[PDB]
Amino acid sequence: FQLLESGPELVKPGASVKISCKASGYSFTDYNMNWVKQSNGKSLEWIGVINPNSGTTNYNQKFKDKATLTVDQSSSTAYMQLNSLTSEDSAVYYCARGGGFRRGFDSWGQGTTVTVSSAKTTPPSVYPLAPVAQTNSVTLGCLVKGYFPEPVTVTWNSGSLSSGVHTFPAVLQSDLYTLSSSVTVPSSTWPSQSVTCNVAHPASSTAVDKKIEPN
Amino acid sequence: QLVLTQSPAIMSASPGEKVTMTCSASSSVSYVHWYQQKSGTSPKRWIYDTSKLASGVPARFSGSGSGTSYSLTISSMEAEDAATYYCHQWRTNPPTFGAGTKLEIKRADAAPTVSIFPPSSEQLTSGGASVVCFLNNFYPKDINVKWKIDGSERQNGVLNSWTDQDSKDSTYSMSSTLTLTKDEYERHNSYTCEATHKTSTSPIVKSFNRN
Numbered sequence: 293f294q295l296l297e298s299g300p301e302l303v304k305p306g307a308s309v310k311i312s313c314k315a316s317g318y319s320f321t322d323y324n325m326n327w328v329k330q331s332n333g334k335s336l337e338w339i340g341v342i343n344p345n346s347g348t349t350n351y352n353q354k355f356k357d358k359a360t361l362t363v364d365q366s367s368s369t370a371y372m373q374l375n376s377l378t379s380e381d382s383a384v385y386y387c388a389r390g391g392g393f394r395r396g397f398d399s400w401g402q403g404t405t406v407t408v409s410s411a412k413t414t415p416p417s418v419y420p421l422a423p424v425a426q427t428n429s430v431t432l433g434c435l436v437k438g439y440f441p442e443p444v445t446v447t448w449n450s451g452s453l454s455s456g457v458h459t460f461p462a463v464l465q466s467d468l469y470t471l472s473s474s475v476t477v478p479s480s481t482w483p484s485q486s487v488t489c490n491v492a493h494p495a496s497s498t499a500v501d502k503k504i505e506p507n
Numbered sequence: 508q509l510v511l512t513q514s515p516a517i518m519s520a521s522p523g524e525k526v527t528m529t530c531s532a533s534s535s536v537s538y539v540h541w542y543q544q545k546s547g548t549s550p551k552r553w554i555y556d557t558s559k560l561a562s563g564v565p566a567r568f569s570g571s572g573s574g575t576s577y578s579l580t581i582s583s584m585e586a587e588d589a590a591t592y593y594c595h596q597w598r599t600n601p602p603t604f605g606a607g608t609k610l611e612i613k614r615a616d617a618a619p620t621v622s623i624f625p626p627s628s629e630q631l632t633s634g635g636a637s638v639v640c641f642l643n644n645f646y647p648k649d650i651n652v653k654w655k656i657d658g659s660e661r662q663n664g665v666l667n668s669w670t671d672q673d674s675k676d677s678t679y680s681m682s683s684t685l686t687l688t689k690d691e692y693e694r695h696n697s698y699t700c701e702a703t704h705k706t707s708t709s710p711i712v713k714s715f716n717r718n
């Protein structure tokens with residue numbers, strides 16, 4: 293039993309979007325489908341529920357004319373359509389299978405991240421972070437700045453099997469995201485062995501590699 | 508609607524320590540559901556019908572309550588349980604969730620390993636100059652940082668970002684980025700990163716000079 297949702301979406305304010313939820317492994321028509329909104333990782337807001345067998349809907353009064361729930365019994369797929377989108381609607385939306393009375397939401401899709409903004413897709417600018425003190429270990433980093441939208445994936449490749457890596461959440465400055473990633477390796481490995489940060493931005497279809505160099 | 512209030516909002520606990528978190532209802536209900544969520548993933552049904560444990564959840568967990576008072580209990584905390592937990596009710600339309608109880612794991616304190624990085628010549632040639640300061644591996648989360656130029660303090664033009672509790676050593680980390688243009692960085696020479704943490708009264712200081 294698993295639910296797959298459509299990929300992330302960047303949309304202009306005022307426009308609409310339609311999220312899909314492909315069920316599998318169970319009788320799609322026998323279990324209701326609920327939709328949940330999670331704004332910036334905090335609380336959970338219940339949007340509505342649909343009966344896939346009968347197609348009858350029940351919406352949260354806060355989401356009457358914001359969300360429209362439909363279903364395709366043919367392809368065992370639930371749908372949620374969001375209209376008149378604003379920055380307030382930018383969030384992660386989940387479809388969760390209603391397991392029945394006194395059973396709760398017993399299955400959740402991976403979620404879909406929608407972004408409502410006027411900013412255009414921009415690839416990242418990557419800058420190396422190398423030390424210009426001598427100690428036991430060495431910490432390096434890469435600064436990812438000027439990209440949009442989220443997210444990005446930084447992967448380090450060094451000549452050492454130990455990698456104290458830290459990924460810092462992105463912060464929004466000048467209407468564009470900025471991220472930092474750090475790595476800690478033994479001193480005897482760098483710069484005696486190449487260290488590279490691989491920044492992947494799928495939204496712009498760009499992967500940038502930076503070899504860290506001494507100063 | 509019917510409001511759910513979870514307490515505490517955030518808490519810590521050591522391995523083997525017993526944990527309990529409450530879910531209060533603005534009016535009497537008959538049962539609640541508990542959902543576990545870890546960073547960057549979807550909520551999972553953890554406990555349903557107040558007391559029933561889902562498939563594959565450890566026996567350490569348990570749930571009880573009635574009316575307006577409900578609670579989730581862990582007999583012996585483990586690192587696997589560090590996550591946020593929401594309660595859920597549907598006694599009346601619409602259903603509601605609690606604000607959540609972020610359950611972190613407790614460990615011994617640690618001082619932050621600090622490292623400063625000047626603007627790369629690459630960024631300089633692009634009309635920018637960002638100086639970075641990594642405050643890695645410290646506990647607890649609470650920390651403060653300040654930037655100084657030749658001894659003079661500089662507020663704002665700074666961004667800070669905290670990482671979630673690391674899954675391997677249960678520590679925290681934060682990055683501090685003082686962003687300038689080029690000539691704004693070209694005036695002064697010495698740039699200093701000063702960090703203040705609960706562990707020590709004296710701040711941890713790393714710095715550099717342009718030349």
Ligand SMILES: COc1cc(S(=O)(=O)O)c2ccc3c(S(=O)(=O)O)cc(S(=O)(=O)O)c4ccc1c2c43
Binds near residue numbers: 598
């Ligand atoms: C007034 O309480 C209502 C009402 C509906 S409704 O949408 O059919 O009005 C419900 C519709 C669906 C419910 C569902 S499910 O079918 O999506 O698993 C579960 C639950 S429960 O809290 O797990 O019992 C509910 C508990 C209470 C519920 C409802 C459910």
